[PDB]
Amino acid sequence: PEPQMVLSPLTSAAIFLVVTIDSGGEDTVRDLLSDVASLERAVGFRAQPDGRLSCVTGIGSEAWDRLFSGARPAGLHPFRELDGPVHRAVATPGDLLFHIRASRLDLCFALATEIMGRLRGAVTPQDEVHGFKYFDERDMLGFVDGTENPTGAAARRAVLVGAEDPAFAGGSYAVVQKYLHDIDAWEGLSVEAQERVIGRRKMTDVELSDDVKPADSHVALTSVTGPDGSDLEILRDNMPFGSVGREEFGTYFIGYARTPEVTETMLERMFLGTASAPHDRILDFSTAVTGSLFFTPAADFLEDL
Amino acid sequence: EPEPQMVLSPLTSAAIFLVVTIDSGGEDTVRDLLSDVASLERAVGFRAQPDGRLSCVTGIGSEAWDRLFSGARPAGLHPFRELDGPVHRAVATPGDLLFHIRASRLDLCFALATEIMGRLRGAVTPQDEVHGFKYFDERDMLGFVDGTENPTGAAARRAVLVGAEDPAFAGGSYAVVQKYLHDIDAWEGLSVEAQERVIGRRKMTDVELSDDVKPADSHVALTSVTGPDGSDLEILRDNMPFGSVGREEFGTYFIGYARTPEVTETMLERMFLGTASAPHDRILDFSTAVTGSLFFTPAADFLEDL
Amino acid sequence: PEPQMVLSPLTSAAIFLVVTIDSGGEDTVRDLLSDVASLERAVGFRAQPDGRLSCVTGIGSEAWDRLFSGARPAGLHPFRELDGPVHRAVATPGDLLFHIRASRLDLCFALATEIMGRLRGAVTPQDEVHGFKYFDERDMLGFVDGTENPTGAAARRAVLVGAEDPAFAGGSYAVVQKYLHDIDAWEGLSVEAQERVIGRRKMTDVELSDDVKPADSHVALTSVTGPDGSDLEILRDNMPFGSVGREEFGTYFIGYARTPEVTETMLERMFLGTASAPHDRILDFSTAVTGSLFFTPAADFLEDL
Amino acid sequence: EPEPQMVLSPLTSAAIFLVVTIDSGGEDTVRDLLSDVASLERAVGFRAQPDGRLSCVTGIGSEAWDRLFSGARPAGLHPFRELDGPVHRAVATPGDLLFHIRASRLDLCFALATEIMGRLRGAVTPQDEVHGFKYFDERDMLGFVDGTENPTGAAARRAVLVGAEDPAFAGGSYAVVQKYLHDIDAWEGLSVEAQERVIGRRKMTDVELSDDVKPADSHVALTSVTGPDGSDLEILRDNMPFGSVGREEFGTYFIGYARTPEVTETMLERMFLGTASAPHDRILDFSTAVTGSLFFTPAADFLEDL
Amino acid sequence: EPEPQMVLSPLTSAAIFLVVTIDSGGEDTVRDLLSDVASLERAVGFRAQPDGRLSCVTGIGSEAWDRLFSGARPAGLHPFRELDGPVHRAVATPGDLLFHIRASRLDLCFALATEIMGRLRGAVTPQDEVHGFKYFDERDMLGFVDGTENPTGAAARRAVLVGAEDPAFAGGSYAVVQKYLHDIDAWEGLSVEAQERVIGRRKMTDVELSDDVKPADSHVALTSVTGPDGSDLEILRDNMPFGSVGREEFGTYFIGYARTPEVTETMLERMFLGTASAPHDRILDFSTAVTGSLFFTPAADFLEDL
Amino acid sequence: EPEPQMVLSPLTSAAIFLVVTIDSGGEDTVRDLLSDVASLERAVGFRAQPDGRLSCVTGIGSEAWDRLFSGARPAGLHPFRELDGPVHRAVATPGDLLFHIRASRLDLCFALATEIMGRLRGAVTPQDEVHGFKYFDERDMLGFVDGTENPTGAAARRAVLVGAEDPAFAGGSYAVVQKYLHDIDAWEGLSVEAQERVIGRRKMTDVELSDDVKPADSHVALTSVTGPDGSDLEILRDNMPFGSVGREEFGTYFIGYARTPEVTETMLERMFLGTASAPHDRILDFSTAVTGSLFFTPAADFLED
Numbered sequence A, C: 001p002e003p004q005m006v007l008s009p010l011t012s013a014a015i016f017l018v019v020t021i022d023s024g025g026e027d028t029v030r031d032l033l034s035d036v037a038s039l040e041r042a043v044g045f046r047a048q049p050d051g052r053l054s055c056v057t058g059i060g061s062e063a064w065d066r067l068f069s070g071a072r073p074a075g076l077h078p079f080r081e082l083d084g085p086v087h088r089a090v091a092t093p094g095d096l097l098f099h100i101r102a103s104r105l106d107l108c109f110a111l112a113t114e115i116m117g118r119l120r121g122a123v124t125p126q127d128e129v130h131g132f133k134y135f136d137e138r139d140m141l142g143f144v145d146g147t148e149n150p151t152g153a154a155a156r157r158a159v160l161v162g163a164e165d166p167a168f169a170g171g172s173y174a175v176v177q178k179y180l181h182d183i184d185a186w187e188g189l190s191v192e193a194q195e196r197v198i199g200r201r202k203m204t205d206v207e208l209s210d211d212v213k214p215a216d217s218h219v220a221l222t223s224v225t226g227p228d229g230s231d232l233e234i235l236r237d238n239m240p241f242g243s244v245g246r247e248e249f250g251t252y253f254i255g256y257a258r259t260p261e262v263t264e265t266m267l268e269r270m271f272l273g274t275a276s277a278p279h280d281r282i283l284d285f286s287t288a289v290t291g292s293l294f295f296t297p298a299a300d301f302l303e304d305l
Numbered sequence B, D, E: 001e002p003e004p005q006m007v008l009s010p011l012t013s014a015a016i017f018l019v020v021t022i023d024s025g026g027e028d029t030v031r032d033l034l035s036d037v038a039s040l041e042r043a044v045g046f047r048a049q050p051d052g053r054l055s056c057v058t059g060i061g062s063e064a065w066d067r068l069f070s071g072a073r074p075a076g077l078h079p080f081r082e083l084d085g086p087v088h089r090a091v092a093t094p095g096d097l098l099f100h101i102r103a104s105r106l107d108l109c110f111a112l113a114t115e116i117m118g119r120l121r122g123a124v125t126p127q128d129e130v131h132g133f134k135y136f137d138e139r140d141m142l143g144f145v146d147g148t149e150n151p152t153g154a155a156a157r158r159a160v161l162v163g164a165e166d167p168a169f170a171g172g173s174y175a176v177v178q179k180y181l182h183d184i185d186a187w188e189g190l191s192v193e194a195q196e197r198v199i200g201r202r203k204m205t206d207v208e209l210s211d212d213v214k215p216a217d218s219h220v221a222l223t224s225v226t227g228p229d230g231s232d233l234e235i236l237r238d239n240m241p242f243g244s245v246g247r248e249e250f251g252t253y254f255i256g257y258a259r260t261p262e263v264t265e266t267m268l269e270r271m272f273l274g275t276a277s278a279p280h281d282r283i284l285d286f287s288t289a290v291t292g293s294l295f296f297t298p299a300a301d302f303l304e305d306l
Numbered sequence F: 001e002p003e004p005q006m007v008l009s010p011l012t013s014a015a016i017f018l019v020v021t022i023d024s025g026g027e028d029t030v031r032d033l034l035s036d037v038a039s040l041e042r043a044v045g046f047r048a049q050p051d052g053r054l055s056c057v058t059g060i061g062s063e064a065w066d067r068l069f070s071g072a073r074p075a076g077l078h079p080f081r082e083l084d085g086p087v088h089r090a091v092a093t094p095g096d097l098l099f100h101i102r103a104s105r106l107d108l109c110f111a112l113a114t115e116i117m118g119r120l121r122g123a124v125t126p127q128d129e130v131h132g133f134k135y136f137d138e139r140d141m142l143g144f145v146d147g148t149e150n151p152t153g154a155a156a157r158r159a160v161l162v163g164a165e166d167p168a169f170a171g172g173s174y175a176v177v178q179k180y181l182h183d184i185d186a187w188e189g190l191s192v193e194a195q196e197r198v199i200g201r202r203k204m205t206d207v208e209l210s211d212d213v214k215p216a217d218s219h220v221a222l223t224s225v226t227g228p229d230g231s232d233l234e235i236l237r238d239n240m241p242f243g244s245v246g247r248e249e250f251g252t253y254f255i256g257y258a259r260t261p262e263v264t265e266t267m268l269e270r271m272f273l274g275t276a277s278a279p280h281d282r283i284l285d286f287s288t289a290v291t292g293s294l295f296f297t298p299a300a301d302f303l304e305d
């Protein structure tokens, strides 16, 4: 069974578009979802082969129910507020996601255009982000970001619903959250200190030896081992965004996993603490201003509506 | 020549346009930054060569010029002329400084813009910030190829660079910016044949319409203007689309360099006020100017030294 | 069971070479077919991985009988002439086909040279066509060409012979037609009208909605659904060619499928019509001057002689 | 003042060569087209920047020149002088106009060719049309590297461009074209050692053979000429392979620009007729000229002015 | 599956080969390194995607295996067998560990090598270090195309990866390495026709010589072997040239992966000792082996878990 | 008049440095080679255009110049001036010829070097041979961006090329080479903040430190010189890392072209001996010069004769 373009090459542009369905607009959305497959290609085909245009369409809990005839993804729920001693992970409205990516921005902008064209009226926009990669895979804190993602079969294994919920095998669970960074603060740190916050070296992107790496460091609190005894894995594609004018500097978080337990556990760790840690040090510089969750169906699923 | 700023740039695929005003007090901080701008271009740009083609061109407004330097003014430098037409209005908005930042990747623009606005925290107020992108086959937001008739080589040198006529500032140029917003609902209502009648070229093949077919109210008609000699009077453009899908904003950011503004301003008069032949440029029936500023972009020597 | 390079990546250049077998060349041809796989590699290897050289070799009905004995592919027959009210699809000679593709012309030409080198004397050339990608995947009518072709495993299952004819699993059925356009006339239509002939938008390459799309449009007559409701798909890699000297502007058509009943259906609809369409409007501007049907065997069938 | 045609184009990987005659009374339609050729280059080319590298060079024959303009003639311009050698014959074939169209993709050449011959349908007759491509690693059909010793940069400017010596037409050049067909069966019969003896360089490493050993009937031998000026006489070539495998046709399309034909013509004399110490260029024993034409390729502004 | 190491690698243009021995009581420090090597691949490589193509393949010798792990041994693992032939000798040199580092640029190889040997300072002794580079058209030091007949896709899967036959170590492979030096003076003494007789393919066009005419002492002859399975017996090679013009050293570094060494070893027997119808592989008359070592390159999961 | 050698060369990522001495009686063989070197550049380079970017610059030592030619000597040409400083010593090593060979790929350098040393077997003795490689983001072995503030375009012409001041040799330049070895263990001991204090720029963003904060014993400090008139005195560098992991050798090969050596020499005086401000350039505390040689690289015409 065939999934949407979750596993993409590195792509260096993206548009993240989040919307909510006015009541009334649920037949208009059924319609767009059937066609969304074919608009990917309308825009993408003439740009082969550099384009690498891909759209991942995800649906939120509330919206699922309004929209669909029968039974529900196992894992799907509203995103869960995390009300921690110090940091708060908020929970924002979000019925639909379009995760648009390609090797150039206009390709994304063309597809977003053609989509909202068919929705004008039936939805209301919540959030829109125009993302770009730094020329050597850095995020807004200046660290290489993407290094430890899974590949090949590991990724096919850690992202796609399989036999555990087999009416939607080929689906995935996306979490999104927009973060805004306190760059004045962050850049006030020594590099040595910043490594302590992330858990890897700034310039060479090597992992800090197991005994020099703080446990409040991001890489510590997100390395998390199952019942299974094996490592538990998500797939990210965090895109910097922002505005120099509005002093806005951001990293847009997106995290695919085969179940939301995995993503959600990493987030408890980050916002609430462990045995040995108050909260994730990175959040002392990064404020979450969105949060939603979505299921991103198989592609077979959408074509048939 | 004196060595000029990177006005003659290749096709680049992304740009940031940053327009600011100088607060009271900020005079000093700005002079410091202008001396260093050259060198920030290189810091940020050098490690990504030659895939990169980062260029920053810095220009200065009329009012701002007087606050910053004493001595001679460039001959042509003035506030942008507001044009109150029968139908369409070309408006004048404030801007003391302009940064036209261009490269093949957006992040290179943004890294440079960060370093610049970083060093001007305190000293300015941002008026306009636009992130633009070329559509994949050099087309603009109306779906026509955009930049075809621009000059190159030495003809460009002749059209944009101040020379002997104001020798103090040889190597400089006069940049005019206007941010336009388009009414696409309306535009996509026309047949292609009609749209070509607005622009004056063929949509798909980008060939000029023949002299006997091309309407007098077409864009290409009203912006071809002939000199004293009857030789065509030319500018350099690098119009970039921008916008936002959520808030139905589809735009073309206009930018135009010339050796003297009398040229650029002529084209505007014809566009907004009309000739005997044409009421106004049909393109304005789909495009609304919401900014307007005039700037002088000095030779890079002039910044390197103070 | 391993197949010939029918599913090739998007390539920008191609040679189409069609020949007939002289009497007493049968030997020399079998020798060549055993080696063709290996000449692909000789020539192609040194220009990897930009190269994307692929050669697909197919065989006509009458030629098959002269070369082998025993069981024949179920579907293999001479191309069916179509004598329609208006438009006629012709049948031309063709014992062998070489569909050679790459990213550079020289690679195609070097391969074609080494093949015709080994067959100089055994065959007679009937048709030789050098094609090229126009801009951004547009054909000679100026529309985007390839867009609704199947990809990935949908293509696997629509072009490759399987269980239904198990002796020849891994094979395919290519149909070729050389078409010429009366551009004269086509450039006489407004774009609105031209879209009405094709069934998609010229510039944005989006489908016309079913409420406006004429039933005499190309996209109309070439969408066919089966008894079981699912789409019947083929794979095309139409290549423009021509000569400006002789005002010859063409699109060379090629169509692979797991059975010709599919390709042939689409042709019947194009040339002869439905209830609600006289014939495909595209033929009012396009003239078929060849027609040939070939079977492209699994690669192990050729290696093993 | 004067800007020349894109003769000094980079190495490009595809070309169309189109040669035509002017029909009776077609002179008008052609002048119209020559004024616009520059503009069609840009229409077609601009949207495919910067990969495209589309260039068209337009040249004009001797007899055609008189039909189209009088006024001054370029000093050197004459019909191609037929060379009836002891063994090998360099023939003269008809040709009033030449379009040497080059880019990185064939479709760009063909799209320009379409637009040109579109405007000339009726007024001309095509004599020769050739689609040429790069073979691997700048090799020709005989499998040797082809273009190595071409002059570059400003040395090219000096060798190809008409200057002060004929100042009316400064910026022009003299293109000679010949279409050659090869006898591959015969050529691939030679050992590589022997083939190198024909050409005068090493096949694989493309190094010159030493004075010690290079035959004087080798191609590189016969085409090295020193002037009275003691300096080497240099031309610029962009030899392009073409062919069809069906009709056993393997070719090199030859084209040679120089500031004067006396130069190109000399090399030909040596190739076809021989020296004191060599019968004819060994290359001709495998290559047959089936066309031959001479043209003048004016400065680009000269065509603008019609 | 299990995940195997990066044995089936794309075309890469550069490589570092590192062979070391483990000192007294280095066993601990090495196990530490092996657990992390996968992740240093990614540290160094990830930020240079997708041009980089950086891959590191890590192998272990027979004696070294026993020091580091007990548990099962891989079926095939043994010290490299010296072959003391009639004429030519294949030597055995020491090697406990192997790093076969490949990418598109050398500096990426070197950066990875640095980070590895950084973590082993103290605990090993370098035996062999080689910086290799492909010629631009996949040629080796003898001037022939090298890699052509290597298997691809799942036929490579089938040839190289330990499978069911020893399921403990499925995903592993057997690398044999040998460093060769050439006497190029001697080699460049042959005509090309003769050189093709040594190799068994055409120099220029890289086509196999016909079964009629290919010598049985040619390299391609002696290294095509058929099994019991009727099937051809295949390995995977990634020969890289290296050398130094100062020290008149020109080399081909050989490396050969297979699912069992019985395969690789057979080819060597035929090369060095001869068959019924060949004294030795003609290629050895121009190539001298100066190293020789055998390694097992485990499944990648086997390293992660230490 | 003059066309110069390929000194103003594009950014290239690979290089061979070859330094040799002329044996007794080899004067003949060398003159022959120098006449031909121009044309070996093109033999080897032409078939790889335009990716290849192969260039060779050939320079000649002071002692050697006298052996080879009679007539004028370049005004500036002399043996390298040894500098025995308080702490660090810049040494003089032997060198009659230099080949500074550069391309995008190393095989191209090596193929050309083969052809050169092929034609000199017997007539020279190799002193130094170095294979260099630029790291992916224009960084050197210390991990800083290297090349940033080099002059370009016309400013380079003005700073590197002999002109009217010695018009016999206009089109020439003066190359100085030094091979440096680093103590990396020591260097990677420093915090990044400290390392920036050695260099005078920011490691990660490669921005100059402001005039107030920049140490006057920093590298960038001691190598900014202004002339008598107060216009900045510039050279052109193309520092290339090299090394060997086995033999713990990690290096930067230095090369510096200028229109007169008295410029390059000045920078060195400041580096090795000090100003009042500075004991010596902090970079030498981590970098040891183990070669040193000076060469004149003629106009290219001069070799054609």
Ligand code: HEM
Binding pocket: A139, A140, A141, A143, A144, A145, A146, A147, A148, A149, A179, A198, A200, A218, A219, A222, A223, A234, A236, A238, A251, A253, A255, A263, A266, A267, A282, A286
């Ligand atoms: C401002 C937000 C964030 C930034 C700037 C950020 C940055 C980073 C960086 C620099 C790394 C190290 C390189 C790498 O392996 O990617 C990393 C690793 C990681 N991050 Fe984040 N991150 C952010 C938010 C999150 C969130 C919300 C999650 C999960 C809910 C997450 C999950 C991970 C995981 C699983 C790893 C790798 C664990 C391993 O190394 O085995 N990150 N992040």
Ligand code: HEM
Binding pocket: C139, C140, C141, C143, C144, C145, C146, C147, C148, C149, C177, C179, C198, C200, C218, C219, C222, C223, C234, C236, C238, C251, C253, C255, C263, C266, C267, C282, C286
């Ligand atoms: C003669 C010149 C032809 C031209 C220029 C041409 C061009 C096109 C174009 C532009 C499209 C729409 C873009 C796309 O869907 O790929 C199209 C669609 C298609 N064409 Fe053709 N075509 C030609 C002949 C044929 C023939 C002979 C066949 C079949 C026997 C065929 C089969 C198809 C199919 C199956 C589709 C897609 C159906 C869908 O939208 O679900 N074409 N053609």
Ligand code: HEM
Binding pocket: D140, D142, D144, D145, D146, D147, D148, D149, D150, D178, D180, D199, D201, D219, D220, D223, D224, D235, D239, D252, D254, D256, D264, D267, D268, D283, D287
């Ligand atoms: C079939 C026709 C031709 C072929 C295949 C051919 C091919 C070649 C080849 C392989 C070379 C050696 C590499 C190079 O230096 O470019 C060469 C050199 C040259 N060819 Fe030709 N050529 C042909 C015709 C001509 C003609 C007709 C001329 C002049 C009328 C010409 C003029 C030259 C010149 C001047 C050189 C180089 C001299 C120097 O070494 O300094 N070629 N040609």
Ligand code: HEM
Binding pocket: E140, E141, E142, E144, E145, E146, E147, E148, E149, E150, E180, E199, E201, E219, E220, E223, E224, E235, E237, E239, E252, E254, E256, E264, E267, E268, E283, E287
């Ligand atoms: C000494 C330097 C060596 C060089 C320079 C070299 C070079 C070549 C070349 C040029 C080819 C032909 C192209 C191809 O198919 O790759 C080839 C084929 C091959 N080489 Fe080598 N080789 C060397 C050593 C070895 C060794 C030691 C082995 C095995 C022990 C080996 C095994 C093979 C195999 C199996 C083939 C292809 C067989 C087939 O045609 O089906 N080579 N080698």
Ligand code: HEM
Binding pocket: F140, F141, F142, F144, F145, F146, F147, F148, F149, F150, F180, F199, F201, F219, F220, F223, F224, F235, F237, F239, F252, F254, F256, F264, F267, F268, F271, F283, F287
């Ligand atoms: C010892 C190894 C050397 C290394 C690793 C090295 C590295 C660097 C680095 C990273 C920079 C900053 C980026 C740049 O502008 O290029 C720099 C600047 C510079 N270096 Fe070096 N360098 C070395 C030796 C030398 C030597 C020996 C000289 C001169 C005799 C020299 C002359 C310069 C000059 C002139 C500048 C620029 C002045 C200005 O900033 O306006 N370097 N070097």
